[PDB]
Design a protein around this ligand. Structure first.
Ligand SMILES: [K+]
Ligand SMILES: [K+]
Ligand SMILES: [K+]
Lengths: 15, 187, 187, 15, 187, 15
C-alpha cells in the first residue's frame, strides 16, 4: 500500500 | 575605501532584511498570521479547463487565498478574468493602514521575459464597518518595469479591499501573486 | 582596502551558507529527513476556537509536527498552553548530539515588534532506551533580543526531548516555530 | 467542476 | 579599492539573482508553471516500508512530481531503485531547449557530509512527437564535488526525458531533488 | 472538534 495523485495540464495555467 | 569587516557587516544586515519577508514589514494580510479572504466579496476566480487531477478526479484552480500566501513561484497566483477585479481581505488584526505591498514573478523567471498578466493601476479601500461602502485609502500603479516586490505608502480597519482597475495588457486574465498590508495596531 | 573580486567572493560564500539551511548544519530533527514526533509524549496542543475550515467542516490547529518543518512565517508554529511544555522527537538517525537550534519569527515581522510568545529557558534530554528517564544534555535560554535563529552547543541518542521551562511572558501560550538537533552519526 | 476550501479566523491564531 | 555604494550595489544585484530561482532562468519543467510528469513513462518509484501515516492509514512515498517542485530540503526528492532510471516531463510550453539544471542537497546538510545517492552521469532526450524514439539533446555528469545547483548547456520540444545512467554510488537507490529545463519559446 | 495526521518512520527515507 502506496499512493499518488496525478497532475496534468490541458492548457497552460495562469502565470 | 571599505574594509573587510565592513563588507561582512553590510551583507549580514542585508541577509537579515532579506530573511525578514524581504522588506522587514509585518504583514497583517498574511493568512498564516491570521488573515482571511472574504471569499463572497472577491472577483470571480477565472478557472478554465487547465489542470486535471487523476482516474480524472478533478479540475485544479487557484483560490484567492494564495494572494495571502508567501509562495510566489510562477503559477502560484490567483487569477480573475479581464483587467478589472477585486478582493476583500480581513486583516489578522485591526490596524491603522500605512502601506500595501504587491509582488509579481520576476521577468527573468517568466517566459518571453514579459509579465503581461500583472496588475497595473490598483486602489485600496478600507471598510470601517466590517459589514458599508469602502473608504478610499489610496490609488497606485504597479510598475511592470519595477522590482518584483513593490511597496506603496499612503482610521483603523480590519477589512481592506484591493481593487485592480487595469492590468499590464493580458487579453484574458490578471494574476495576483501576493498582496500585503502594513500598519500599526491600535492602542 | 578590499578589492571587487574579494567582495564577490565574500557574498558568494555568504549566500551558500544562507542556502544551506541558514547555518550549514545537518538537522537530524528535520521530519523530511526522516524524523518524527512522539505525538503521545508531547505537551497538549493548545487548540482554541480560532481557525474554521468551510460549510463549517472543521477547526484548524497546528500539530507539533511543524517544529520539525522548515516553514517559519508567522503562525506556522506549534503552540501549547502556559509557559511550560515539552516535545519528544525521534531523530532521523542515532547520533551523538552536539548542538540544538531554536528559531522564532523576527520581531520586525511580528506585530507591535515584540515576540512575547517565544520560549525563554529550555532544556534538552536524551532518551537512551527509546523506551526510560531522560538524561539531561544541557540547559539554555533563548534570547528574545537575539537573532531569530539561535544555535546552542553542549552518548548516542535517537530520541530527544525539548523541554521548555519558561516563555518570554505570553499569558496564554508558547509558540515553537522550529527545533533542530545537530551531531555526528555513530561509527 | 472546480474546488475551494475556505479558511477564516474567529480569533487570532497563535503567533 | 571599492566604495561603500559599490558594495551595496553588488549585494543588491546578487540577492536579486538569488531571489530569481537562484540562477535567473525560466523553468519550463516547473510544475506550477504548467509542466507535468508522464507518470506512465517514469522509472518505478522506489517505495519501501519507510513512512507510515496514522491509526495506520497509509504508507508515504515521494512521487516523481517533486523533481518539478522547488522545495529541496533533504528528503524532498524522488527516488528510484538502483543507479539507472528515467523520467519524462511535459514542459509547460513548446520551446527550443538550451539548458537543463540539476540540483541535490548540499553535503553540509546531508549526514556524514556525503551525497552518495546523487546522480552522476545523465542524459537528455527530446521527444518531437509527444507520441516516437527520443532524440539525444546531450549527455552530462553531475559533479558530486560541485555546487548543489548545477546547470548544463547543450528543434522545439514539449516532451523531454531526463535519463540517469549512473549514480554517485548509493547501493540501493538514486534521489532526484529538482530537474529544470531552460530555453526559448517558439516564434 | 480538532484534527492531526501522524507521521512516523520505520526506516530512514530516501535522502
Ligand atoms: K502566493
Ligand atoms: K515550522
Ligand atoms: K523538489
Amino acid at each position: 500500500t502506496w499512493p499518488h495523485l496525478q497532475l496534468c495540464y490541458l492548457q497552460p495555467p495562469p502565470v | 575605501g571599505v574594509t573587510e569587516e565592513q563588507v561582512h557587516h553590510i551583507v549580514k544586515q542585508a541577509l537579515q532584511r532579506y530573511s525578514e519577508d524581504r522588506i522587514g514589514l509585518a504583514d497583517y494580510a498574511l493568512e498564516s498570521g491570521g488573515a482571511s479572504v472574504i471569499s463572497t466579496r472577491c472577483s470571480e476566480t477565472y478557472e478554465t479547463k487547465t489542470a486535471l487531477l487523476s482516474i480524472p478526479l478533478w479540475y485544479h484552480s487557484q483560490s484567492p487565498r494564495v494572494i495571502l500566501q508567501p509562495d510566489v513561484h510562477p503559477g502560484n497566483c490567483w487569477a480573475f478574468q479581464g483587467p478589472q477585479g477585486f478582493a476583500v481581505v480581513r486583516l489578522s488584526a485591526r490596524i491603522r493602514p500605512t502601506a500595501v505591498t504587491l509582488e509579481h514573478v520576476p521577468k527573468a523567471l517568466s517566459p518571453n521575459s514579459t509579465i503581461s498578466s500583472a496588475p497595473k493601476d490598483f486602489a485600496i479601500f478600507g471598510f470601517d464597518e466590517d459589514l458599508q461602502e469602502g473608504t478610499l485609502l489610496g490609488k497606485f500603479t504597479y510598475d511592470q518595469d519595477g522590482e518584483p516586490i513593490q511597496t506603496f505608502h499612503f482610521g483603523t480597519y480590519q477589512v481592506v479591499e484591493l481593487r485592480i482597475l487595469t492590468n499590464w495588457g493580458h487579453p484574458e486574465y490578471t494574476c495576483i501573486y501576493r498582496f500585503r498590508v502594513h500598519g500599526e495596531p491600535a492602542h
